[PDB]
């Protein structure tokens, strides 16, 4: 045994970490969706004559590391998850290029006063107040940010641990009421939590799927989507065309057509897209 | 959704499911949209008017 | 601060006059408040810490 | 740093198990003059000089219990404990590779659903340590069924006290101890005793004057009773303590769970189920030197006993009825 | 390491009468009530429960025996006795004396028992002090069980009568002996017989139907060694219970609870402690052993 | 057949005092953490103000009181020893075969003893580098706060979100600055402006600033240590020199002895001072002397004037004027199949739509597409370019 | 400072085929009726009780199990073995070689049982001395009380088939009895189509109980009728069957019910003595890929 | 060593496989590709080292 008393002498931030060199994207930016038959297996339909139809039409551990039986190998890195929020047909594309929330209302709590429950709740789940982002619309949808909405029915729920390993869900990061109201404090204390502590239920590392993490003796992850409370967009094109017009000419890009559109990616990392050999930074 | 009370008591939160697609109200599915769905619908099963 | 008993290992001093009359009865029936017992192996100098 | 190798040779070569007494022949009559720990009487001189009794102090018997390192889902084992609690190991299936579940005495109250009409003291206590009950029943959905047929007590292997805890938010490290008297990790030259909650203990020695002799021993016993509340299965842990030998205690425990038996067997009077006739069993946990005293303690409120010099000799369940 | 010795102070100088029987049992076993070096006489005998003016029963005496520590004599000095002490795990020298003399060997199996054949023999009285000393009686466990077998017989048949070739004789290969029953308390033997309905009637409920049918295949034409209790006659009960057609998994769960309660019948047919003997001589009657509080 | 050798591996001893981390700590030898509960630190911060003749209520002076603690830690190494070794350690030593068996079994235990030292010397490195990251902000929560121009006012609702839209101005552009450092036109003067941004924005404030701790050759100054991996260090050995490669550090530690009148308050009371003699000369020996700098350095230096200097070698580079040392903490981890704690793993989220609609006055800003034009179509899919650059529906 | 080492010398050297079968294990459990340091081979097996010429039995093993002294192999030299004595509350290392292979678990409880299985799976026959050595069957206690459980059921219904085979269907027998479901795991034993006979005397006992035992409670119910008679035992009229309460003590004469009620309790103790367990050792820590354990002995 | 020291699991093996390609397409034929580079004669020296 050997025991150390370490101390912080001066009252200045004397230890700065900086993300410098990217080495390896691991989690695929894949398309694989997440299936609530493995998150809520405790429920089913009332008639088993019909529940035995849908699971047919749609769809454990090993040495201390989680491992699904139905994939004996990947090729494109750790297979990510994808999630489902019903959204109105008349939502607006101009919301979607901007780093914002998957909710309707924005949710940056740091702007509110310290130690206020009511003054911090009025950002999230009210509607007489407009958005802090827009002002004509007061919420992008009252189907994922109404106080009782499906953005709350799905993911208010704290992580129920189970002997079977649960899988990660990124929409909990933006919907969980209690974890967001932890950031009520003044922002000097919000520095000192961001370094040493860790939030509720982040994703794994070196697995097959995106499980829940339960070890803490190895985890290193520092995700800043906890703190700043936004979600970046990447590429999409509702027809095949606008990917080609994205990579043919970037300056005279066509962002919107009658029925089709595009979102340019805005992310702290920037890659080299390589369809063929044309290169978009 | 709708809200109604018992006679002489507090209000309740009782619900229905909108069954057909047309029971989605207009500002979630405008009349130009629902018309443009039937034209996609027309060119799959190929009914000829 | 309510200054109470402490078991820290002082350099105690002892008088001449005895005290030991009626003590086994009196300390068991509240002669003085905040009394501390000693039962064999506990009767030693407490471990100092600070 | 050259003197650092001394202190790892002082406290190491001096701390070794005593070797087997093996001496070659041809020196002669020497093999008796290494034998010291058999010698038990000493020269009681005029004044006891510590330089004259040092050999009666340097010698010692060979006392060392065994530690067992565990892993914990950090929900089952509450982030604080009074460091001397009692444990189990509810093992069902080799789920991962380094996976384990433990049970405190307050938790097994919470997993059960037994009422404050049997235990009105720690019901208020454990409500802040854990959830409303369903925080722990998520790990085992079999608790509606393992309690029906009474097969629950076959899976609890008792462990004993606690020694060391290295606690995090996600993984809780628990270093327990079997066979008993384990050195702490805060302070050397300490001995971590055992503690139990006052609600769960029921003692058996207290009587009118009216005579019973003592011994070297008093043997802390554990129990379980698969009773039924709200027409639902629900266990009943109690404790037992007596230095009275194993013969009496099974006859004595029926003087304790007396009225509970007369309530239940009216229910299965009208229906027969052979899986239901089991009632509960008795464990065995270790020995305490009788003539020792439990000092009361306090928490947030909660009275908790203590026992010094507990050693932990385990034992299995035997179904009394 | 340790000392294991109990000296006993005494308040009257011994006669030549009360030296005589103590010198006979110079190495033997007697329990005592405490754990001290020095000790007064009223704990040494077993006679704080087996007195004269009372009407003692041996079940309470045996129940008393599992509590107490146990000890072996060393000397009889005229001032004062001298004993040695039995730890949980210890290697000693024991040397039997007791009167209906059996024979031991290596790997034998002992049990400390009350005096069950002669109170007049086993209890010498010290009239110089007045308080007598009662001795226990070490027996191999085959007969150590068999007397407790025979004791619980007797208290049944005395009450329903409210003969002596049957009720009070512990049989053994070589000698058939005679118990000492005239004035016993039937109530701590009532309590043991209270718990037996709490087993013997519960085992009557889940009687496996498959194990019943084997008896008609056994006693009706097939003399076996130990089945001569039935004397080649079926009882009336088995003719009445076996109306069912058998089924395998029904006699699994029946045979589990049947298997579980019979692990608990030890808790009523207990012994005291045990003495697993690893070495034995014949020409000295010396023996070494290890105690077990059990 | 033939043996051609038994080849060995002797691990070189890494002591914590002769690394390059010692510039980022202050080392004191200590006696009993099993006894000590806490260590209290009292800050007395005065604060002057301005007398100004505007129409304003003037302000009294101020005074600040700041509390600190210590941090408990535990380190555990686990030697095994085999029983057949332990027996013949005490052997009678009478045969000519024993001197290749006794001497061949003492090398099981003295190798395992020095194994126990090297697990300990990880704990001096790991548990510092863990805790130095337990108190570590990123860059963007420092620099927007390291501008005094924003904390001149209060932290009211205007100054709050004005920072929040600058945390993202630093996140989106200036993250992964070495990855952008190749495909920019300038290059070398982008890393230098990013790093010298980081260096002087660390509010050091360094209570031991007068103490001459770590000088280089020629009496110059060391102003801290940046600690990276090796794949980043090789990028920095080319952009930046190794101008001196020489420093001077302590040859020992600083003592903590409770001799004298420290012991009296230690036993009888709880508390116990530190430099109780110096604390005595302020109160009874020569009292009521006002606090000045030149009487601090003979007392603020614990022993750190008096430890004899030595010769320590590491990497040294000019950045602005502050010398910065660069480390290589991979030899402490990549030898032993443990992860390296510098290689953190950033996660994100990615917001993403599918299956939308647009209002009545549709249009086409377009270079050229002849294809989808009609309002009868309704797109019901999207496309994402993969990590490995394959568009998936 | 105590010493323990049990060397077993031999008369004949071992063959090159036998020693490899004895290097297959290096640490196991042997009953060993000894306290000496030198010992002849006629005790380290179970052939002192369970051998070829006499028929094997299952009490006399279980009597001999608790009576005896356990020991652990350390080494097999060609001349001689080297066992290690087992102190009460000792601490040492154990591997398994046992047939069939029951996978362990750390922090479990172990009983020591006889081999009632296949002889090729059980023992190692020595031809160097012509004398068998037999190993005990080291199983955890819940599995050991379950592997006995349905085999004891399996042996009783065999004798019904030889008397009248129209009562038990073997498909109903070979499905519910030769299957062990514990630790969520399945196992399958040897059906033994050679002819079994180890567990026959329990089936000789427990079936002779089942006419004696429910006959026995009616006399005990009318025994000590008082108002001291214990209040819990009023309840157990509801448990006793309706048919049992229609038996007279008339036909069985008073000199015969003596010979019942001694023989009644005699089997009810000796069956408790074997169902209550044998000598044991608890294992606290364990790894699967090495098969090495960590034990502490618990005598009885 | 930055890649392998999680243990060669199922994911880490195949993320190496997509680096047997982004190094195969780009950094192959390092003499010939470094004659049509603007920088040129430094790309060879970095590939060698």
Count of extended strands of chain E: 13
Using the CA coordinates, give the radius of gyration of chain A: 22 Å
For the biggest β-sheet of chain A, the strand order reads: 1-2
SSE order of chain A: HEEHHHHHEH
Radius of gyration of chain E: 23 Å
Could you give a short account of the major beta sheet of chain A? 2 strands, antiparallel
Structural class of chain A: mainly alpha
Structural class of chain E, please?
alpha+beta
The shape of chain A, in one word, is globular
Q: In total, how many domains does the architecture of chain E comprise?
A: 3
What percent of the residues of chain A sit in helical stretches (DSSP H or I)? Answer: 10-25%
Largest sheet of chain E: 5 strands, antiparallel
PDB class: virus
Keywords: human herpesvirus 8, human tumor virus, dsDNA virus capsid assembly, HK97-like fold, virus
Entry title: CryoEM structure and atomic model of the Kaposi's sarcoma-associated herpesvirus capsid
Chains A, B, C, F, H: Major capsid protein
Description:
It is classed as virus. The entry lists the keywords human herpesvirus 8, human tumor virus, dsDNA virus capsid assembly, HK97-like fold, virus. The structure is cut from a larger assembly and holds five copies of chain A, one copy of chain D (321 residues) and two copies of chain E. With 281 residues, chain A is mainly alpha-helical. Chain A contains seven helices and three strands. The relative contact order of chain A is 0.12. The N and C termini of chain D lie far apart (66 Å). By secondary structure, chain D is of the alpha+beta class. Chain D contains six helices and ten strands; from the N terminus they run ααβααββββββααβββ. In chain D, helix 3 packs across helix 4. Chain E has 294 residues and is α+β, with helices and mostly antiparallel strands. Chain E has three domains: 1-140 and 269-294, no CATH class; 141-180, no CATH class; 194-268, no CATH class. The longest helix of chain E is centred in the middle third of the chain and has 21 residues, at 141-161. Classes of the chains: A mainly alpha (281), D alpha+beta (321), E alpha+beta (294). Chains A and F meet through helix 6, strand 3 and helix 7 of A and helix 2, helix 3, helix 4, helix 5 and helix 7 of F.
């Amino acid at each position: 045994t050997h025991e150390i008393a370490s101390l912080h002498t001066a009252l200045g931030y004397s230890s700065v970490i900086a993300p410098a060199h990217v080495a390896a994207i691991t989690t695929d930016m894949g398309v694989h969706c997440q299936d609530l038959f493995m998150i809520f297996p405790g429920d089913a339909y009332q008639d088993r004559q019909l529940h035995d139809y849908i699971k047919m039409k749609a769809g454990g551990y090993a040495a201390g590391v989680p491992r699904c039986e139905n994939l004996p190998g990947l090729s494109h890195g750790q297979l990510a998850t994808c999630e489902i929020i019903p959204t109105p047909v008349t939502s607006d594309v101009a919301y979607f290029q901007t780093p914002s929330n998957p909710r309707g209302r924005a949710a940056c709590v740091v702007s509110c006063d310290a130690y206020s429950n009511e003054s911090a709740e009025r950002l999230l789940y009210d509607h007489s107040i407009p958005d802090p982002a827009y002002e004509c619309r007061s919420t992008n949808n009252p189907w994922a940010s109404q106080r009782g909405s499906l953005g709350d029915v799905l993911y208010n729920i704290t992580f129920r641990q189970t002997a079977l390993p649960g899988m990660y869900s990124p929409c909990r990061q933006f919907f969980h009421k209690e974890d967001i109201m932890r950031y009520n404090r003044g922002l000097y204390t919000l520095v000192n939590e961001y370094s040493a502590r860790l939030a509720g239920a982040p994703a794994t590392s070196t697995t097959d799927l995106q499980y829940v993490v339960v070890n803490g003796t190895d985890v290193f992850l520092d995700q800043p989507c906890h703190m700043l409370q936004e979600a970046y967009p990447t590429l999409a094109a509702s027809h095949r065309v606008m990917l080609d017009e994205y990579m043919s000419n970037k300056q005279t890009h066509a962002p919107v057509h009658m029925g089709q559109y595009l979102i340019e990616e805005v992310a702290p990392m920037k890659r080299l897209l390589k369809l063929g050999n044309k290169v978009v930074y | 959704f709708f809200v109604h009370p018992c006679p002489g008591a507090r209000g309740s939160y009782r619900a229905t499911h909108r069954t057909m697609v047309g029971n989605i109200p207009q500002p979630l599915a405008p009349r130009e949209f629902q018309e443009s769905r039937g034209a996609q619908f027309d060119a799959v099963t190929n009914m000829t008017h | 601060m309510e200054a109470t008993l402490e078991q820290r290992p002082f350099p105690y001093l002892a008088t001449e006059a005895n005290l030991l009359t009626q003590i086994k009865e009196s300390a068991a029936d509240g002669l003085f408040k905040s009394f501390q017992l000693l039962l064999g192996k506990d009767a030693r100098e407490g471990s100092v810490r600070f | 740093q050259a003197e650092n190798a001394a202190r790892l040779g002082r406290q190491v070569l001096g701390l070794l198990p005593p070797p087997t007494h093996r001496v070659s022949l041809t020196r002669g009559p020497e093999f008796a003059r290494g034998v010291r720990d058999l010698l038990s009487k000493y020269a009681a001189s005029t004044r006891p000089t510590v330089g004259s009794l040092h050999e009666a102090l340097r010698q010692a018997p060979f006392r060392q219990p065994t530690y067992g390192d565990f892993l914990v889902y950090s929900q089952t084992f509450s982030p604080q404990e009074p460091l001397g609690t009692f444990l189990f190991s509810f093992k069902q299936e080799d789920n991962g590779s380094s996976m384990d579940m433990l049970l405190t005495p307050t938790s097994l109250f919470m997993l059960s659903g037994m009422e404050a009409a049997k235990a009105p003291q720690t019901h208020k206590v454990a409500g802040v340590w854990y959830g409303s009950g369903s925080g722990l029943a998520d790990f085992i959905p079999n608790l509606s069924e393992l309690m029906d047929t009474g097969e629950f007590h076959t899976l609890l292997t008792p462990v004993g006290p606690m020694v060391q805890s290295v606690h995090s938010t996600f993984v809780t490290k628990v270093t327990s101890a079997m066979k008993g008297v384990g050195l702490a990790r805060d302070e050397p030259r300490a001995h971590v005793g055992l503690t139990l909650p006052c609600d769960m203990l029921v003692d058996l020695d207290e009587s009118c004057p009216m005579r019973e002799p003592a011994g070297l021993n008093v043997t802390i016993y554990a129990s379980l009773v698969y009773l039924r509340v709200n027409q639902r299965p629900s266990m009943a842990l109690t404790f037992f303590q007596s230095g009275k030998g194993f013969a009496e205690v099974v006859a004595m425990i029926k003087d304790h769970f007396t009225d509970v038996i007369r309530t239940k067997y009216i229910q299965l009077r009208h229906e027969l189920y052979i899986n239901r006739l089991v009632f509960g069993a008795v464990c065995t946990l270790g020995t305490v030197p009788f003539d020792s005293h439990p000092v009361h303690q306090s928490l947030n409120s909660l009275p908790v006993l203590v026992f010094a010099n507990f050693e932990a000799a385990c034992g299995p369940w035997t179904v009394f009825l | 390491a340790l000392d294991k010795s109990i000296v006993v102070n005494l308040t009257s100088r011994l006669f030549a009468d009360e030296l005589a029987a103590l010198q006979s049992k110079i190495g033997s076993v007697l329990p005592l009530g405490d754990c001290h070096r020095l000790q007064n006489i009223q704990a040494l005998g077993l006679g704080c429960v087996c007195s004269r003016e009372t009407s003692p029963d041996y079940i309470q005496i045996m129940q008393y025996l599992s509590k107490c520590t146990l000890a072996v004599l060393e000397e009889v000095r005229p001032d004062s006795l001298r004993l040695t002490r039995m730890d949980p795990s210890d290697n000693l020298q024991i040397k039997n004396v007791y009167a209906p003399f059996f024979q031991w060997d290596s790997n034998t199996q002992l049990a400390v028992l009350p005096p069950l054949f002669s109170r007049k023999d086993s209890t010498i009285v010290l009239e110089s002090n007045g308080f007598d000393i009662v001795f226990p009686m070490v027996v191999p466990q085959q007969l150590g069980h068999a007397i407790l077998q025979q004791l619980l017989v007797y208290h049944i048949y005395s009450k329903i009568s409210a003969l002596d070739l049957y009720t009070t004789n512990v049989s053994f290969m070589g000698r058939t002996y005679r118990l000492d029953v005239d004035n016993t308390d039937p109530r701590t033997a009532l309590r043991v017989l209270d718990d037996l309905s709490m087993y013997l009637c519960i085992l009557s409920a889940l009687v496996p139907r498959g194990c019943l049918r084997l008896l008609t295949a056994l006693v009706r034409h097939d003399r076996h060694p130990l089945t001569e209790v039935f004397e080649g006659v079926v009882p009336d009960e088995v003719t009445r219970i076996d109306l069912d057609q058998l089924s395998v998994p029904d006699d699994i769960t029946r045979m589990r609870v049947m298997f579980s309660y019979l692990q608990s019948l030890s808790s009523i047919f207990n012994l005291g402690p045990r003495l697993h003997v690893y070495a034995y001589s014949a020409e000295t009657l010396a023996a070494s052993c290890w105690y077990s509080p059990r | 057949e033939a043996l051609l050798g038994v080849y060995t591996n002797v691990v070189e001893f890494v002591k914590f005092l002769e690394t390059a981390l010692a510039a980022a700590c202050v080392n004191t030898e200590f006696k009993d953490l099993r006894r000590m509960i806490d260590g209290k630190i009292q800050f007395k911060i005065s604060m002057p103000t301005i007398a100004h003749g505007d129409g304003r209520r003037p302000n009294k002076q101020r005074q600040y009181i700041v509390m600190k603690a210590c941090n408990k830690h535990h380190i555990g190494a686990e030697i095994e020893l085999a029983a057949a070794d332990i027996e013949l350690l005490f052997a009678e030593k009478e045969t000519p075969l024993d001197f290749t068996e006794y001497a061949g079994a003492i090398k099981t235990i003295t190798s395992a003893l020095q194994f126990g030292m090297d697990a300990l010397e990880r704990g001096l490195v790991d548990t510092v580098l863990a805790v130095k990251l337990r108190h570590a902000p990123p860059v963007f929560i420092l620099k927007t706060l390291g501008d005094p121009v924003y904390s001149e006012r209060g932290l009211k609702k205007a100054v709050k979100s004005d920072m929040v839209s600058m945390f993202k101005a630093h996140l989106i552009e200036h993250s992964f600055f070495l990855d952008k450092a190749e495909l920019m036109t300038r290059g070398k003067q982008y890393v230098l402006t990013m790093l010298s941004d980081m260096l002087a924005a660390v509010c050091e404030d360094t209570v031991f600033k007068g103490v001459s701790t770590y000088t280089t050759a020629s009496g110059q100054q060391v102003a801290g240590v940046l600690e990276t991996t090796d794949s980043v260090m090789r990028r920095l050995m080319n952009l930046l020199g190794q101008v001196e490669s020489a420093m001077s550090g302590p040859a020992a530690y600083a003592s903590y002895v409770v001799r004298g009148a420290n012991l009296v308050t230690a036993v009888s009371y709880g508390r116990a001072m530190r430099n109780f003699e110096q604390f005595m000369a302020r109160i009874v020996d020569h009292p009521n002397a006002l606090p000045s700098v030149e009487g601090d350095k003979a007392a603020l230096a614990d022993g750190h004037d008096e430890i004899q200097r030595t010769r320590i070698a590491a990497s040294l580079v000019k950045i602005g004027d502050k010398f910065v040392a660069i480390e290589s903490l991979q030899r402490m981890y990549n030898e032993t199949q443990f992860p390296c704690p510098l290689n953190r793993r950033i996660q994100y989220t990615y917001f993403f739509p599918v299956g939308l609609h647009l209002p009545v006055p549709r249009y086409s800003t377009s270079v050229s597409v002849r294809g989808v034009e009609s309002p009868a179509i309704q797109s019901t899919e999207t496309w994402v370019v993969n990590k490995n650059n394959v568009p998936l529906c």
